[PDB]
Structure 1
Amino acid sequence: ATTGTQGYTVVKNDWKKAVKQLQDGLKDNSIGKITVSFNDGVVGEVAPKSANKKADRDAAAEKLYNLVNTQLDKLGDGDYVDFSVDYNLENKIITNQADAEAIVTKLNSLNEKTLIDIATKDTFGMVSKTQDSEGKNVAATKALKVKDVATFGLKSGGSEDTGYVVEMKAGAVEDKYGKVGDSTAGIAINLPSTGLEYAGKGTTIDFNKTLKVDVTGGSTPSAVAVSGFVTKDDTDLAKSGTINVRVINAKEESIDIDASSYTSAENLAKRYVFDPDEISEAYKAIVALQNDGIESNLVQLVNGKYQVIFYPEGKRLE
């Protein structure tokens, strides 16, 4: 890894849970390759021989742990372990039938979310396939929810090798889109033709983008579509690429501004010296996010709190 690049920086005490995320990443196929480095020098490569086989993914995870466990557990001052992680969140699968069913339930907990409401004379919504005896659109029986559009469950050919993979199967909808009492025939609802598999895809399902309706035209609508699985990265970094993990021999200082006692920004400056650019880049990303809603990898919503990360040069004198 290279200092300053995008990636996770784990402190020594949490080396085990971080390595567990990489092991889970190798097991679940999020990770195609991990290049390991002790300090600045490359010492080993971890990569499943065939991603299709379980044993090869487990072998890769065990070797990863064995390689880095003494180096990490006995990590001295100034020492570190870098993992360059070739990943593809799109290839991530669920290797445990219990965890796969946990994702199927995540999806099934959406079944009752309304995507399109029943139509009215005032508001566009769901109308019937056939018009009444006078040639006017009549409201539909039920609202369009997620249970309508797609069913969930683990794939038929699922196994620990191929993975249990929650699979969505597009449904069928006879109901259309329009206003009640209108003479124009209802518009056909386009169901998901892509993103039909969710392997826990090195991601978490983005429910704002997954199974969401896209009406084109509104007051005069011309097309309606429903997206399949659209994920969000568990890190804001892209669905494919490479991330750096680096373990360091540093103490974790969690600074919660809502806390009763936390390091005041004055006493934090008094205890450590910080890189000016590290602060200013984080600050610019915060200002942009505050004023306009602009998201950045530098500042992120994690556990109901906006967070920034700083690695100070060292302690301050006196």
Structure 2
Amino acid sequence: SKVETGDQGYTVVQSKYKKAVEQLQKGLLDGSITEIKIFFEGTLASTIKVGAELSAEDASKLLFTQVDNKLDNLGDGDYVDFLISSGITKLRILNAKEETIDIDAKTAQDLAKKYVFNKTDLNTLYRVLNGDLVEEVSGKYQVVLYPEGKRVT
């Protein structure tokens, strides 16, 4: 069990640091998260096992104590990963910028001339958007995209 790029799981930006840890903490206390393994820059940080002579209330405080300083001073290319076990779940926190494009208004040809997207990711996304993940958030149908890099000029 190891976390690596291009794998099934959740991805959070540093802007959503405060929210991600809250859900991990509240999950830890309310008997919903059993074990957490933190990874700084792909290296093991420490293991939080509620059954390792520890407790849920201690584990909640311990989790924030370890990662509050790391995640508040993130650098370009620095990332923190979690192996969340509920009985399984994978998370990566990174310091990218978040930009939302409301189409009911940046066109696609300006988006492509700037960022380089993976064809195999867009291929599957197009197919599952018309026939053979996409979320419905407050009357809209949002889709998240992660470019591989910036376009040459």
TM-score per shorter chain, which class? Answer: 0.7 to 0.9
Corresponding position of 2:114 = 271
TM-superposed CA distance for 1:303, in Å, is 2.8
2:10 is equivalent to residue 8 of structure 1: yes
Task: Work out the CA distance in 1 between the residues paired with 2:143 and 2:5.
Answer: 16
Amino acid of the residue matched to residue 282 of structure 1? Answer: L
Amino acid of the residue matched to residue 314 of structure 1? Answer: G
Runs of 5+ consecutive residues of structure 1 not aligned to the other structure: 89-241, 290-297
CA pair 264-314 structure 1, distance change in 2 beyond 3 A: same
Structure 1 runs (4+) deviating above 6 angstroms are none
TM-superposed CA distance for 1:49, in Å, is 2.5
1:19-38 matches, within 5 Å, as: 19-38=21-40
Corresponding position of 1:284 = 127
Task: Work out the CA distance in 2 between the residues paired with 1:256 and 1:34.
Answer: 36
Task: Work out the CA distance in 2 between the residues paired with 1:74 and 1:267.
Answer: 32
Corresponding position of 1:151 = none
Report the structure, 1 or 2, having the larger strand content.
2
Corresponding position of 1:244 = 90
Amino acid of the residue matched to residue 244 of structure 1? Answer: K
SS where residue 81 of structure 1 aligns?
A: strand
CA pair 312-78 structure 1, distance change in 2 beyond 3 A: same
Larger Rg: 1
Task: Work out the CA distance in 2 between the residues paired with 1:244 and 1:310.
Answer: 18
Task: Work out the CA distance in 2 between the residues paired with 1:82 and 1:48.
Answer: 19
Amino acid of the residue matched to residue 309 of structure 1? Answer: V
TM-superposed CA distance for 1:7, in Å, is 1.8
CA deviation map 1:173-193 (0-9, x unaligned): xxxxxxxxxxxxxxxxxxxxx
Task: Work out the CA distance in 2 between the residues paired with 1:284 and 1:31.
Answer: 34
Aligned residue pairs: how many? 150
TM-superposed CA distance for 1:255, in Å, is 2.1
Give the one of 129, 138, 141 matched to 1:303.
138
1:1-318 matches, within 5 Å, as: 1-49=3-51, 56-87=55-86, 242-258=88-104, 260=105, 263-288=106-131, 298-318=133-153
TM-score by length of 1: 0.44
Amino acid of the residue matched to residue 152 of structure 2? Answer: L
CA pair 303-6 structure 1, distance change in 2 beyond 3 A: farther
TM-superposed CA distance for 1:33, in Å, is 1.2
TM-score by length of 2: 0.88
TM-superposed CA distance for 1:301, in Å, is 2.1
Task: Work out the CA distance in 1 between the residues paired with 2:137 and 2:90.
Answer: 19
Q: CA RMSD in A?
A: 1.8
Report the structure, 1 or 2, having the larger helix content.
2
Indicate the structure whose relative CO is greater, using CA pairs within 8 Å and at least 6 residues apart: 2
- Percent identity, please: 45
TM-superposed CA distance for 1:307, in Å, is 2.5
TM-superposed CA distance for 1:309, in Å, is 1.9
Task: Work out the CA distance in 1 between the residues paired with 2:138 and 2:29.
Answer: 25
